[PDB]
Write a structure and sequence with these properties.
- This is part of a larger assembly, with chains A, B, C, D and E.
- Chain A is 19% helix and 42% strand.
- Chain A is of the alpha+beta class.
- Chain A has one domain: 2-Layer Sandwich (Alpha-Beta Plaits), CATH 3.30.70.
- Chain A is elongated and about 70 Å long.
- Chain D is of the alpha+beta class.
- Chain D has a single domain (1-96), classed as Winged helix-like DNA-binding domain superfamily/Winged helix DNA-binding domain (Arc Repressor Mutant, subunit A).
- The A-B interface holds A 12, 46, 48, 50-52, 54, 63-67 and B 28, 30-31, 37-38, 40-41, 44, 48-53.
- The PDB classes it as translation.
């Protein structure tokens, strides 16, 4: 029998996640799996602010470091046997992919 | 060999030290880094942090 | 020529028992190895340093079973047992005397080379 | 004493079987992890491997609070003797890669 | 970071006394044995190992944190 089944993707880099996500939509659409489009969650920013000096001398300058994380969701209407097929191609770049057997 | 050869170290600056160089001053506990501030500026690019602003 | 001579019970089984750590060496180890029921074979040198133990170690075998073989050269069984390594054993920084030895485990079995004392317990 | 002979054999047998050793630079933790369970501290591992290095029987490396040790041909010869193993054994690494 | 000013109750370590090996057994007749000092009532230490005699106590040197009798 079929299920409603959910895939989530995560990365730092945006434009590799775009090409990964677009290929998951094509492989589902050509096989009529009635895919629900990519939900963009809010972006997450990590920040660290430090003195530049190793020793505490000089005029008081600071460094401002950050990291950004990007997250997406797609939902499918399909058997548990065929998400295992389409969730295995174009996934070569540094993107996390995770899937759960019921969430809809 | 002695039976009393240590004192409690379950909190404060006695508990924690840098993962790269074993120093105790100016370390970063944020996001689970546990590096010294001088060791962080050295490895920030390899960890994946950048500056833009 | 010849075969199965009594030195087999004093060198070849004894050197094989050391590879398995089976030996108790010298008086207090030997006495403790007789009191706990572990002893299987015993070896005893000539009178050196103290005449009294010559009565004691024989009497401690009479309190159990007389698995006792005699070689009077106090240097020799100390030389035979004298190092655990494969090679270069005979350096003068070791080669100590050893007045008595007792075996707990006799080690790996071969060619009935251990059975001399099991024959002597019926032949003597 | 440095350590009981029961401990010293258990370090050397694990080193000869696996071909390598790893430990952190901390003398205070009560047990070394992995097959050095059944009671030996990592202080005994550091002190044992130091004594094996100054004889030329292992190589040493260090990064970020960890030691790394590798066994070498003179050390294989010495440990096969000390552990009384058959002369034909080489249990750690043998098969040629492709 | 200074020159050192010395203490005056000086020892390096104590000296451990030297004695001959065994006096806990006696031969009384040909084939007759006596044990002069007793084993402690115990699991591992139940044979071949002896309690000391002091002027008012019997003590096990192996079970050294305990196994003391007050006579």
């Amino acid at each position: 029998a079929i299920h409603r089944i959910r895939i989530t993707l995560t990365s730092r880099n945006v434009k590799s996640l775009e090409k990964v996500c677009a290929d998951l939509i094509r492989g589902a659409k050509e096989k009529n799996l009635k895919v629900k489009g990519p939900v963009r969650m809010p972006t997450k920013t990590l920040r660290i602010t430090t003195r530049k000096t190793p020793c505490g001398e000089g005029s008081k300058t600071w460094d401002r470091f950050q990291m950004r994380i990007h997250k997406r969701l797609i939902d499918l209407h399909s058997p548990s046997e065929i998400v295992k097929q389409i969730t295995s191609i174009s996934i070569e770049p540094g993107v996390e992919v995770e899937v759960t057997i019921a969430d809809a | 060999q002695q039976l009393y050869w240590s004192h409690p170290r379950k909190f404060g600056q006695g508990s924690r030290s840098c993962r790269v160089c074993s120093n105790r001053h100016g370390l970063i506990r944020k996001y689970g880094l546990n590096m010294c501030r001088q060791c962080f500026r050295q490895y920030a690019k390899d960890i994946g942090f950048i500056k833009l602003d | 020529g010849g075969v199965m001579d009594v030195n087999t019970a004093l060198q070849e089984v004894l050197k094989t028992a050391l590879i398995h750590d089976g030996l108790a060496r010298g008086i207090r180890e030997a006495a403790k190895a007789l009191d706990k029921r572990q002893a299987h074979l015993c070896v005893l040198a000539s009178n050196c340093d103290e005449p009294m133990y010559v009565k004691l170690v024989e009497a401690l075998c009479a309190e159990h079973q007389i698995n006792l073989i005699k070689v009077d050269d106090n240097k020799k069984l100390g030389e035979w047992v004298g190092l655990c390594k494969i090679d270069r054993e005979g350096k003068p920084r070791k080669v100590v005397g050893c007045s008595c030895v007792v075996v707990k485990d006799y080690g790996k079995e071969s060619q009935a080379k251990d059975v001399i004392e099991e024959y002597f317990k019926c032949k003597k | 004493m440095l350590m009981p002979k029961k401990n010293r054999i258990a370090i050397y047998e694990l080193l000869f079987k696996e071909g390598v050793m790893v430990a952190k630079k901390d003398v205070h933790m009560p047990k070394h992890p992995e097959l050095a369970d059944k009671n030996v501290p990592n202080l005994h591992v550091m002190k044992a491997m130091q004594s094996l290095k100054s004889r030329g029987y292992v190589k040493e490396q260090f990064a970020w609070r960890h030691f790394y040790w590798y066994l070498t041909n003179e050390g294989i010869q010495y440990l096969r003797d000390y552990l009384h193993l058959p002369p034909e054994i080489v249990p750690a690494t043998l098969r040629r890669s492709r | 970071k200074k020159s050192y000013t010395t203490p005056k109750k000086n020892k390096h370590k104590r000296k451990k006394v030297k004695l001959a090996v065994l006096k806990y057994y006696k031969v009384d007749e040909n084939g007759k044995i006596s044990r002069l000092r007793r084993e402690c009532p115990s699991d591992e230490c139940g044979a071949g190992v002896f309690m000391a005699s002091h002027f008012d106590r019997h003590y096990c040197g192996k079970c050294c944190l305990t196994y003391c009798f007050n006579k």
